[PDB]
Amino acid sequence: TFGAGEADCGLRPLFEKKQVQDQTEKELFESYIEGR
Amino acid sequence: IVEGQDAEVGLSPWQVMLFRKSPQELLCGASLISDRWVLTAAHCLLYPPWDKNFTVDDLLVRIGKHSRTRYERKVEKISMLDKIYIHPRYNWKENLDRDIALLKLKRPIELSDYIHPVCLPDKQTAAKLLHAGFKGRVTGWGNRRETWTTSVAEVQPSVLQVVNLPLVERPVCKASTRIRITDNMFCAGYKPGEGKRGDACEGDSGGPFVMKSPYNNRWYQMGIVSWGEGCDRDGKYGFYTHVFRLKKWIQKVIDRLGS
Numbered sequence: 001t002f003g004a005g006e007a008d009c010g011l012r013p014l015f016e017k018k019q020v021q022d023q024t025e026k027e028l029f030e031s032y033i034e035g036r
Numbered sequence: 037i038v039e040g041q042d043a044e045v046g047l048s049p050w051q052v053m054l055f056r057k058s059p060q061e062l063l064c065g066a067s068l069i070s071d072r073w074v075l076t077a078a079h080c081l082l083y084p085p086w087d088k089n090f091t092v093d094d095l096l097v098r099i100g101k102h103s104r105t106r107y108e109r110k111v112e113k114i115s116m117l118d119k120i121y122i123h124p125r126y127n128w129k130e131n132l133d134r135d136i137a138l139l140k141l142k143r144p145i146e147l148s149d150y151i152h153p154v155c156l157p158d159k160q161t162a163a164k165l166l167h168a169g170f171k172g173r174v175t176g177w178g179n180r181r182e183t184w185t186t187s188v189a190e191v192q193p194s195v196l197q198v199v200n201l202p203l204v205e206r207p208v209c210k211a212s213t214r215i216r217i218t219d220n221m222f223c224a225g226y227k228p229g230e231g232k233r234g235d236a237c238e239g240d241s242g243g244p245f246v247m248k249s250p251y252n253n254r255w256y257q258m259g260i261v262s263w264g265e266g267c268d269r270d271g272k273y274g275f276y277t278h279v280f281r282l283k284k285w286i287q288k289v290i291d292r293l294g295s
């Protein structure tokens with residue numbers, strides 16, 4: 001446990017930090033590589 | 037959120053909801069950017085035509101939720117606000133330009149599994165992710181459809197809603213509205229033709245548009261729900277505060293009035 005200001009971010013605990021992917025995640029990724 | 041799904045638990049940890057204290061009422065969503073700074077749209081707080089001008093003592097921030105109805109002992113941190121900051125150049129009397137606001141809590145929150153920061157955007161990630169056709173994600177607990185205002189409106193999500201919407205290119209955004217559109221907003225949602233639907237609606241204002249980067253596998257807030265004509269009308273797009281073109285500001289206040 002530690003405290004601080006805004007630090008690492010944007011990785012959700014129960015997803016990225018567990019290396020799991022959520023239901024809809026795959027649409028965004030498929031749009032990306034369908035553009036540039 | 038019009039055509040969203042039920043969200044997976046702990047899906048958007050950054051999801052804050054603004055309540056008015058007494059009488060209890062969901063007002064807006066917001067994002068947890070830090071353990072004491074919640075981002076929101078300016079208009080949840082100040083829209084003088086509908087006599088809305090919300091004082092610091094009028095509001096309360098519920099963080100860690102999933103159900104809209106239920107108080108959930110185990111997940112949920114209710115803070116209260118020390119300061120409400122709204123942009124000098126928030127232009128309500130025309131076109132909701134620079135519709136952003138930033139709320140300092142009274143008390144830092146202890147992050148948990150379920151309460152955790154958004155990244156704000158950087159030069160490279162804005163420039164890399166904000167292209168037309170790229171899908172981002174809007175969330176919140178607001179109207180599942182466009183509604184005539186009755187008090188018990190019936191259309192209210194049980195569980196937080198998620199949708200994924202394409203960014204649309206500026207000529208097309210400009211072309212869809214008589215209202216003067218400016219450089220610090222962007223729009224998103226499907227074209228007519230594209231098989232698929234989605235929007236935010238009333239009570240999803242203030243909440244994140246986030247995109248996830250394939251660089252380093254983190255999520256960033258590209259937009260804030262700001263406005264639109266209706267919810268999910270053909271030929272109309274949802275309009276979002278461009279967080280990055282107000283990032284130069286986004287830093288400045290937390291670092292002016294700092295301690």
Ligand SMILES: N=C(N)c1ccc(C[C@@H](NC(=O)CNS(=O)(=O)c2ccc3ccccc3c2)C(=O)N2CCCCC2)cc1
Pocket residue numbers: 079083128130131132215235236237238239241261262263264265266267268273274275
């Ligand atoms: N993406 C969506 N479909 C969407 C997005 C946001 C909302 C909530 C939002 N309501 C509206 O935008 C209602 N549509 S509105 O009536 O077209 C509207 C009203 C006033 C305006 C003033 C300045 C600039 C644009 C304006 C747009 C709100 O509470 N506001 C506070 C009052 C001013 C307007 C915004 C609803 C729908």
